[PDB]
Amino acid sequence: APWVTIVWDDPVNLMSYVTYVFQKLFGYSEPHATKLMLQVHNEGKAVVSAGSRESMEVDVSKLHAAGLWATMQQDR
Ligand SMILES: [Co+2]
Ligand SMILES: [Co+2]
Ligand SMILES: [Co+2]
Ligand SMILES: [Co+2]
Ligand SMILES: [Co+2]
Ligand SMILES: [Co+2]
């Protein structure tokens, strides 16, 4: 039962900060982190990680601690 973590666009956050957080928390390459950051900024949201419900719960928590707006939901 796959879940996803979604990050939502916040006016306040620096784009450079969002990119860094995605690299720090998920270990993503710089280009992919930027890709996701840009999707959040341009589309308003983006799926930033996927896996077990338990894994997504922690990803959400980590993101919240970093100051980003994160939610999770079961994948279709
Ligand atoms: Co913006
Ligand atoms: Co723009
Ligand atoms: Co749990
Ligand atoms: Co919270
Ligand atoms: Co809090
Ligand atoms: Co809070």
UniProtKB/TrEMBL annotation:
MF annotations from Gene Ontology? peptidase activity
Which superkingdom heads the taxonomic lineage of this protein's source? Bacteria
Q: Does the keyword Hydrolase apply?
A: yes
Q: Look up keyword Hydrolase and say if it applies.
A: yes
**Keywords attached to this entry:** Hydrolase, Protease
Provide the Adaptor protein ClpS core domain boundaries.
Answer: 1-70
Name a biological process GO annotation.
Answer: proteolysis
Assembly, in brief, is: Binds to the N-terminal domain of the chaperone ClpA.
Task performed by this protein: Involved in the modulation of the specificity of the ClpAP-mediated ATP-dependent protein degradation.
Please give the family membership noted in the entry.
Answer: Belongs to the ClpS family.
Name of this chain's protein? ATP-dependent Clp protease adapter protein ClpS
Q: What is the lineage of its organism?
A: Bacteria, Bacillati, Actinomycetota, Actinomycetes, Mycobacteriales
Gene symbol of the encoding locus:
clpS
From-to range in the entire protein, with total length: 25 to 100 of 100
